[PDB]
């Protein structure tokens, strides 16, 4: 093709959007932005498919153009704006705050947070570099650049950003024994304590993680997002606490819940 593509076929859309197949030919192509195309949830999918606040894309536009939707503390009127991991969505008209947080199935849950929690977000620092006559700079997964970070902050650490001012207020190092979520791969959405990091120079480091129920998995280092110091998260977690039940336990839990009614 010549130049960039502007459309997204509904069936080539990320499967975690949980789009059906008969609504249309196209899926809302996420706009360029802080998060990657396949690692984001567009505002239209959140406000229409997840929250059911709108029935069509026209109503999503009508909501967004009234400036009711804030993403990370800023009003966004782009209905395909890419909202991704850790992003805080505030709807002040209805007085509700959400944080885009993965499910254990790898999907962005509708996770409501308190207005006090909506003041900050965790960000995994993607790189640290010196520029502009010795000024240290830090780049996060959110793609926000921060000048003058703490000298102890390194790549793969997690910082806490106050959304009102956008400066670092705390940080967790990437250490063994720290709680972390998985943001990609087969184990996407799982939460556990980092056990050990096997280093492969010139290749991908593998991080082993142990669930709160004792289940051990492993991912690439690029898929690890440190959540809290020790085993205590710095953010609220969804109803499932990052523990991925097998299909047998899911079936048993569903049957127990169904048999408890009636």
């Amino acid at each position: 093709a010549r130049g960039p593509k502007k459309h997204l076929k509904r069936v080539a859309a990320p499967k975690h959007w949980m789009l059906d197949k008969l609504t249309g030919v196209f899926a809302p192509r996420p706009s360029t932005g802080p998060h990657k195309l396949r690692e984001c949830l567009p505002l239209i999918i959140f406000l229409r498919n997840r929250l059911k606040y709108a029935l069509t894309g026209d109503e999503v536009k009508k909501i967004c153009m009234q400036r009711f939707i804030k993403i990370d503390g800023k009003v966004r009127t782009d209905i395909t704006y890419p909202a991704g991991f850790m992003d805080v969505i505030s709807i002040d008209k209805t007085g509700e705050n959400f944080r885009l947080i993965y499910d254990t199935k790898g999907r962005f849950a509708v996770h409501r947070i308190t207005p006090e929690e909506a003041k900050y977000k965790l960000c995994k620092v993607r790189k640290i570099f010196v520029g502009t006559k010795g000024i240290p700079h830090l780049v996060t997964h959110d793609a926000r650049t921060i000048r003058y970070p703490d000298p102890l902050i390194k790549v793969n650490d997690t910082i806490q950003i106050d959304l009102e001012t956008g400066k670092i207020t705390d940080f967790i190092k990437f250490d063994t024994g720290n709680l972390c979520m998985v943001t990609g791969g087969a184990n996407l959405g799982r939460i556990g304590v980092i056990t050990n990091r096997e280093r492969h120079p010139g290749s991908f480091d593998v991080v082993h993680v142990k669930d709160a129920n004792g289940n051990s998995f492993a991912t690439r280092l690029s898929n690890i997002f440190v959540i809290g110091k020790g085993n205590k998260p710095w953010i609220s977690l969804p109803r499932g606490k990052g523990i991925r039940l097998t299909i047998a336990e899911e079936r048993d839990k569903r049957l127990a819940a169904k048999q408890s009614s009636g």
Partner: peptide, 30 residues
Amino acid sequence: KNKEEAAEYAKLLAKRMKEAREKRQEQIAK
């Protein structure tokens, strides 16, 4: 903003090198 950020990072950086120097002095001394 530039001046305030530079001053704050100067103080924090000085404290960080103080911590690193103290830790390394303790390490070498023992």
